[PDB]
Amino acid sequence: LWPKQVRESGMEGRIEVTDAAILRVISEYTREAGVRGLERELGKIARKGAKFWLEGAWEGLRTIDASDIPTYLGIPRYRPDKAETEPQVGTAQGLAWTPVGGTLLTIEVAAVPGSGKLSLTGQLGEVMKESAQAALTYLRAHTQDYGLPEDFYNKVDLHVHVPDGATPKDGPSAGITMATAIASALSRRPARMDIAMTGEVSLRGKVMPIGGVKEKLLAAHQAGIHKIVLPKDNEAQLEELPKEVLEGLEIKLVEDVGEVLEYLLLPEP
Amino acid sequence: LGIPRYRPDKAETEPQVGTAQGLAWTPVGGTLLTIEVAAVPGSGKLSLTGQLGEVMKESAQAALTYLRAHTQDYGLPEDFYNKVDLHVHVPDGATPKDGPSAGITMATAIASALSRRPARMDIAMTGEVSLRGKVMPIGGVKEK
Amino acid sequence: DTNQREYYLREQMKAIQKELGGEDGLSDLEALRKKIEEVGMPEAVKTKALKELDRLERMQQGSPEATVARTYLDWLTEVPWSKADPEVLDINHTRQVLDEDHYGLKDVKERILEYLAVRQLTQGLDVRNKAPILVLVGPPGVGKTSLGRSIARSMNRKFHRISLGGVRDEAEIRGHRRTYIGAMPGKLIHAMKQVGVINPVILLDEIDKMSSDWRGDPASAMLEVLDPEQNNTFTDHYLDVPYDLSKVFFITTANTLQTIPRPLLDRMEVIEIPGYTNMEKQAIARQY
Amino acid sequence: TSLGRSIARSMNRKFHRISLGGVRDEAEIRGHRRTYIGAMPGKLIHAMKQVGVINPVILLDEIDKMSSDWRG
Amino acid sequence: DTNQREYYLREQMKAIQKELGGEDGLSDLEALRKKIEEVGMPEAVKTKALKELDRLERMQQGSPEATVARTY
Amino acid sequence: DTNQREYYLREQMKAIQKELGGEDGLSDLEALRKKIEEVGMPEAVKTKALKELDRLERMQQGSPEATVARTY
């Protein structure tokens, strides 16, 4: 890519770029599943380099590191690493595969004392509501181990917001995502950032496996999440993926929804 | 000069209860938007007038959710959400910006009708809202 | 009676074209025949102009094939060569000229400087596109004309512009082969006739509203003219010979982010033109 | 659509994508029933016209946006 | 004078065209005429076929009103 | 006399069109008219049929003002 862009603008043997600068362009100036964005970003770097060179060729070979990138681009539109934002109360970084590139569905659920029912916002589907119901049903089996009062279902309304309008995968794939979202919201403790998750939740509290583990392992690299949670029933689904996809990940193969919540719920009560 | 073709009435917030100013834009010219919310004690359901889309519906739902989270911070009852029909007038239809761009404007419009206190003059605003009570960044700040 | 009166009206309109008739009597088939030797022209173009002369020897208001052939000859002999607008290879001089459009806009001037620094730094290190021409995007009331005029002033190009926005027939964009009237040399050919320097600036106005009732998409001609490896061989329905357009610079303007064909997304890119504010309008008013 | 070019090189063929994004009738994959000059065939015949051989590698890009809001 | 001259010349062209070997006739049209006359067919179907055959003799080659007849 | 001369002028149109090319569409729009206004129908219905038939002076090749007119 870069040897094409620096040849678009006639930078033959004039501009060099290190690994850190390309990584800055990747993780700080474009977020999409493909590499179309990096083409135009490196093109803009080439054009700015041609501009700065045309007003004086002082340097024989200009090294562009991860420091002078903004001079050609400006402000990082996205966080460098997603491990720097905050832990939030009602936030669960989901995983999905939107046909326009993978992205994390920040499903947000708010618990308000009141009648006791499920408020269903954000264009849920049938399966999305059933997943919320399944998460509540499991959380009802074990409540005193999460600090909740045993009468929470009788008196707490839950406002659930799922982005991307309807379900993006055209099917439930964020079971444990909603499980941890609702557990944090009901317990009102900061859920963990920096860890995306996906799965299926079953009322006995079992993590049924997902389809297409490759997409749920990519759409967390593109989103910048470097610790993913997967169902244990997909352990053999990690024996055909290329080694590049598995690079940088601390994958927690899980089977219960009592061990997905070991990670995110560091504050239980 | 003759008859004034333009007016300075788009430089004002119209400080009456429920009235709020939403900053909007078009790629061919400049404009704004206003909203008024009447809180009539009724069935407690949102009635949208102005051919509004659903996005305003969940934005108002999030505003009411944040109101319900901290009713005691504005001296509000814990049960009036079921009793207040919100009757909303917006001159335009859907929001020209994708999703909510007057989300905080909508939140304050809903809260004004539930707080019996008007808006502040010469203070405009725009932004996105989240159900947890956080304001999300708005893109295209230049046009706004 | 009405039909005969309208027939006599159109025939009298045909008769009262004395100015066209005078050119046909002396300039056409005689001065044009010598015009080949008087001016420098490519050998193949000269010989095809010789056939175009052979397409003459009949009245130009009779068979429309002869009329459109004479239009081809008039748009041929009035396009000289071996001349070009001088370059200013300094971005600083271009910025200096940009300083007085309104003030430079402080943003778009820099994007145009990107485009110019790439323009001077190419595979041949010359004016060859191999890249977009970066249509302008913004409200229609902004100084869209001023940017192109200032760049032409700085870069020393004889600025042109042609009508491509809002049209509905393809004779102001492409034209159609010289076998019937109503098919005319394209406006790009007219601009190339406007001046002989082979590096003009053919501003394309309101490209976002380009359309036509003539089915057969002109966007193919856009791809043809926007590709420097294909703009030298830029043909249309009308252009029966690949007309050598090698050093011709290009630029375009638009005012909407939606009304644009997708074959106009590669070899084409966005420049956003911010609107002016009451303070910006105050300053630009008072000063200019 | 660069993988198409790679396969085309590996096969010494041509390569010509045809974006179907923004097609909602058979009047653009097939043509209009020819009854007047001023109407084209569909897209595939334009594709074959662009290339010069009977064995290209056509890439029907954006086939999901192929929709039908109109008669046909 | 020139217009009446060219009008008579165009009429000469048209008159000679009908006598120019009848190329358009039979080869591009009557082939369908035989196929109607050589299929074991119900009487009403042949009546309808002849009715729609007499609807022709106007140039659908510039008129969409009889391309439907040819396809019918 | 006037109310019949209107229909007489319509009949003169439809009969001169016989001598015109296409033979009045092989005597069409007269089969529809007679099958309507020979079978015993209410008079107001006959009149409104006359109007809704008079809308056949428009284009038909996709416009929803002659296909639906023919169906009606």
Q: Active site includes B97?
A: no
CA dist A188 and A152 (Å) reads 13
Query: Residues 6 or more apart from C257 whose CB is under 8 A from it?
Result: B27, C137, C270
| Residue C205: strand pairing partners | C163
> Three-state SS for B39?
strand
Residue spans of alpha helices (H) in A156-218: 175-187, 213-218
d(CA B121, CA A29): 39
Look at the alpha carbons of C255, C261, C262, C268 in this order and tell me if their dihedral is positive or negative.
negative
- B27 at interface of C, judged by CB pairs closer than 8 A: yes
Chain-chain contact of C214 with D38 (C-beta, under 8 angstroms):
yes
Sign of the C-alpha dihedral computed for residues A142, A144, A148 and A149 taken in this order: positive
The answer to whether B142 faces chain C, any CB pair under 8 Å, is yes
CB pairs under 8 A between E and F: 11
What is the rounded CA–CA span in Å between residue A11 and residue A52? 12
Give the SS3 label for residue A107. strand
Q: Could you tell me which residues come within 8 angstroms of residue C64 by beta carbon, excluding any fewer than 6 positions away? A: C180, C181, C182
Search chain E and give the residue with CA nearest D35.
E64
Within 8 A of E60 by CB-CB distance, chain F residues are none
HEC profile of chain F? CHHHHHHHHHHHHHHHHHHCCCHHHHHCCCHHHHHHHCCCCCHHHHHHHHHHHHCCCCCCCCCCCCHHHHHC
- The closest CB to that of B29, out of C137, C139, C256, belongs to C139
What are the residues facing A230 on neighbouring strands? Answer: A253
- Give the right CATH number for A91-264 from 3.40.50.300, 3.40.50.10880, 3.30.230.10, 2.40.50.140: 3.30.230.10
Is-contact A50 A9, C-beta < 8 A? yes
Our answer on whether B and E touch (3+ beta-carbon pairs < 8 Å) is: no
CA distance B138 to B101: 7
Those residues of chain C whose CB sits closer than 8 Å to some CB in chain B are 137-141, 255-257, 274-275
Name which of A12, A20, A23 is nearest A49 in CA terms: A12
> Binding site annotation covers B101?
yes
Q: Which residues of C are annotated as a binding site for ATP?
A: 138-145
Which residues of chain B neighbour A112 with C-beta distances below 8 Å?
A: 65, 68-69
Q: Is E62 helix (H, G, I), strand (E, B) or coil?
A: coil
Contacts of D21 in chain C (CB under 8 A): 262
Subunits close to D (at least 3 CB pairs below 8 A): C, E
Structure tokens at D62: 């954006």
Which residues are CB-neighbours of C180 under 8 A, at least 6 positions away?
A: C64, C65, C68
Residues 9-68 of E with CB under 8 A from D: 60, 62-64, 67
Q: In which element (H, E) is residue A268 found?
A: none
Tell me phi and psi for residue C91, to 5 degrees: -65, -25
Q: Is D33 part of any known ligand binding site?
A: no
Structure solved via: cryo-EM
Q: What does the alpha-carbon distance between residue C71 and residue C216 come to, in Å, rounded to a whole number?
A: 23
Environment class of residue C196 by beta-carbon count within 10 Å: exposed (0-12), middle (13-18) or buried (19+)? middle
B8 close contact with C: CB closer than 8 A: no
CA distance A129 to A134: 9
3-state secondary structure string across C6-28: HHHHHHHHHHCCHHHHHHHHHHH
CB A214 within 8 A of CB A241: yes
Note whether A159 contacts B54, CB cutoff 8 Å: no
Give the neighbor-by-neighbor strand order of the sheet with B29-41: B20-26, B29-41, B84-89, B46-49
Note the Cα C2 to chain centre separation in Å. 42
Distance CA D63, CA D66 (A): 5
How distant is the Cα of E64 from the closest Cα of chain D, in angstroms? 5
Q: How far apart are CA A138 and CA A145, in angstroms?
A: 12
CATH class of the domain at C91-272? alpha beta
Which among D16, D27, D3, D22 is positioned nearest to D64, based on CA atoms?
D22
| The two three-digit tokens of residue C178, written as one number | 């010289």
E55: closest CA of chain C, how far (Å): 30
Q: Give, as one character, the DSSP assignment of residue B96.
A: S
User: For residue F29, what are the contacts with CB-CB under 8 A and spacing of at least 6?
Assistant: F14, F53, F56
Residue E63 φ/ψ, nearest 5 degrees: -125, 120
A48 in active site: no
DSSP chain C: -HHHHHHHHHHHHHHT-HHHHHIIIIIIIIIHHHHHHHS---HHHHHHHHHHHHT-SS-TTSSHHHHHHHHHHHHHHT---S--PPP---HHHHHHHHTTSSS-TTTHHHHHHHHHHHHSSSSSSSS--SS---EEES-TTS-HHHHHHHHHHHHT--EEEEE-SS--STTSSS---TTSTT----HHHHHHHH---S--EEEEE-GGG---SSSS-THHHHHHHH-HHHHTTB--SS--S-B---S-EEEEEES-SSS--GGGTTT--EEE-PPP-HHHHHHHHHH-
Q: Which residue of D has its CA nearest to C215?
A: D38
- Give residue for tokens 């050589």: E38
Closest chain B residue by Cα to residue A77 = B139
Nearest CB partner across the interface for E55, out of F25, F60, F61? F25
| Coil, strand or helix at B24 | strand
Binding site feature residues of C for ADP: 102-104, 141-146, 149, 161, 262, 276
Specify whether domain A1-73 bears CATH 3.40.50.10170. no
Closest CB from B58, B78, B132 relative to A122: B58
Domain boundaries along the sequence of chain B:
19-144
Chain C: nearest CA to E58, how far in angstroms? 25
Q: Contacts of residue E64 in chain D, CB cutoff 8 Å?
A: 33, 35-36
CB-CB contact of C163 with C172 (8 Å): yes
Report domain B19-144's class. Answer: alpha beta
Q: How many Å apart are CA C230 and CA E22, to the nearest integer? A: 45
Q: Looking at beta carbons, which residues of chain E come within 8 Å of C62?
A: 2, 6
Question: Which residue out of A131, A173, A184, A187 is catalytically annotated?
Answer: A173
- One-letter amino acid of A121: T
Chains B+F touching (3+ CB pairs under 8 Å): no
* Choice among A82, A169, A206, A216 that is catalytic: A216
Side chain identity, residue B77: P
State the DSSP code for A190. Answer: P
Chain F residues within 8 A of E58 when measuring between CB atoms: 21-22
Strands C270-272 and A62-64: unpaired
Answer yes or no: is A106 a known binding residue: no
| Cβ atoms of C207 and C199 closer than 8 Å | no
Question: Beta-carbon neighbour count of residue C31 at 10 Å?
Answer: 12
Rounded CA-CA distance A24/A20 in Å is 6
For residue C15, CA distances in Å to C10, C19, C159, C211 come to 9, 10, 37, 35
In angstroms, the separation between the Cα of residue C215 and the nearest Cα of chain D is 5
On chain B, the residues whose CB falls within 8 A of the CB of C138 are: 27
CB A89 within 8 A of CB A181: no
Structure-token match 């090294």, residue found: A63
Inter-chain CB proximity D22 and C262 less than 8 Å:
yes
Name the neighbours of C, counting chains with at least 3 Cβ pairs within 8 A: A, B, D, E
- Check if the beta carbon of residue E60 is closer than 8 Å to that of residue D35: yes
